[PDB]
Symmetry: D2
């Protein structure tokens, strides 16, 4: 697993999608992101090691991945339909979710 | 890790919600189901062990957990809102997802 | 935009989906169901005409459609992917939602 | 009915959340946005009047509302729970959607 590695996968596969040529490239990218995001679910981050897993921050931290997992789920559907541009637009809109979690837990 | 133990978690906890006397017991059990479902997302079941990880069956398999994870998410909100009975309903409505996936790959 | 006709639309198109021969027949059916569900969202059922629209019953009632709308939304993706059978399965799975709402508000 | 009636409500209720006091003020405003979005789903904007209802921009348009509705839905929960801080957040993340869909039809 490892949290840092999962974030490597996310950041890298997002870039690919920004400069992807076709739907197939977008599928493969989003699919790998989905796996990293699901894997990162139960990772206790550095800045929350002193709290209980029952804490609001840990529930809020896990809540962030629910949002990310859902967006990728739906974004992959667009890719499967051959809609490269609206898949790329949805890939871009993950950033709002990425930034929100970082801004207060990273 | 073990997919068998992930289903054990999902089953056991679904019974816990079935008879819970307060929100805390529901919240906690739902949280355990979420971690299990997110764990099980990456797995490869027995009937598709030899088959490729990129097969239509495996795409639907992963998709089934995307639905379950998404339902567990909304249920937990309902529990967090103190709406215990509605969370218990929502937990019952998961069975459509459990059964649909079982009807085939189990 | 009557609630009875909206429900007539849901039930009739659910039958259409069961015996559909192509993706477009499923797409069209789901789109009609999507409209009926979006339309019925602001409705008040006979059992709660008396009650205020800000009551818990109406929140839970309206919330029922959020789920149905969400489920239809997803099943339409499956239809657009050419996954007709899985779209039919997802349609079959809607009845957990249909029955949950009827078992109390019908 | 009426597009402009629906859309003006969305930015107005945003400004309540922009600087609200409590879960009360936020929970109310969001529910009005939930009714505006569901009513807007069926509507046809002026720019793509000539294009078929089966247009791929009508689908971009409709799909854009499924995401807004879905995001409203989640912010509403956080407000019910008493997470007034996080409901604003989540309400902040709605902007990525608004301006995206606006980057064409507005
Ligand atoms: C929480 C809910 C998060 C979401 C959603 C995303 N990220 Fe994240 N990220 C998060 C944490 C707590 C950390 C710190 C890891 C650590 O051990 O310090 C990160 C880190 C990254 C990094 C690396 C930064 C570093 O200091 O090493 C990257 C490159 C990164 N995150 C990218 C990223 C992307 C692209 C996301 C969505 C598309 C995303 N993250 C979501 C917490 C969370
Ligand atoms: C696929 C998308 C699945 C979903 C969603 C759920 N389950 Fe499952 N389950 C699945 C498989 C492939 C199997 C077989 C595992 C094996 O190796 O035999 C199972 C098995 C179970 C079991 C039996 C436990 C065992 O001895 O292996 C239970 C009790 C079970 N599943 C429960 C369950 C519940 C409660 C679910 C949702 C609420 C659920 N499953 C979803 C595949 C999938
Ligand atoms: C509430 C959240 C509901 C959901 C979700 C669904 N239905 Fe429904 N339905 C609902 C009500 C309150 C009523 C009664 C309408 C009235 O004024 O009497 C209905 C009614 C129907 C009917 C008509 C049956 C009758 O007794 O007259 C049908 C055929 C029907 N509903 C079908 C249906 C289907 C197929 C749904 C999902 C796929 C569904 N409903 C969801 C409230 C709600
Ligand atoms: C499409 C998928 C849209 C989304 C999502 C949002 N908006 Fe929108 N908006 C859209 C259109 C096509 C129009 C033009 C309607 C018309 O005929 O005038 C609008 C208009 C507005 C307006 C009115 C502007 C004015 O006439 O002065 C407002 C205030 C507005 N939109 C706000 C708004 C907000 C706050 C949104 C999300 C939070 C949002 N819109 C999403 C298309 C779409
Ligand atoms: Zn979608
Ligand atoms: Zn777009
Ligand atoms: Zn909900
Ligand atoms: Zn209920
Ligand atoms: Zn889906
Ligand atoms: Zn199926
Ligand atoms: Zn949420």
């Amino acid at each position: 697993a490892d949290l840092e590695d999962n974030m490597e996968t996310l950041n890298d596969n997002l870039k690919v999608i920004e400069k992807a040529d076709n739907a197939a490239q977008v599928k493969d990218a989003l699919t790998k992101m989905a796996a990293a995001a699901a894997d990162a679910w139960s990772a206790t981050p550095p800045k929350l090691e002193d709290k209980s897993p029952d804490s609001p921050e840990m529930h809020d931290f896990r809540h962030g991945f629910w949002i990310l997992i859902g967006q990728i789920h739906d974004a992959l559907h667009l890719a499967n339909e051959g809609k490269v541009k609206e898949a790329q637009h949805a890939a871009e809109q993950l950033k709002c979710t990425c930034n929100h979690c970082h801004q207060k837990y990273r």
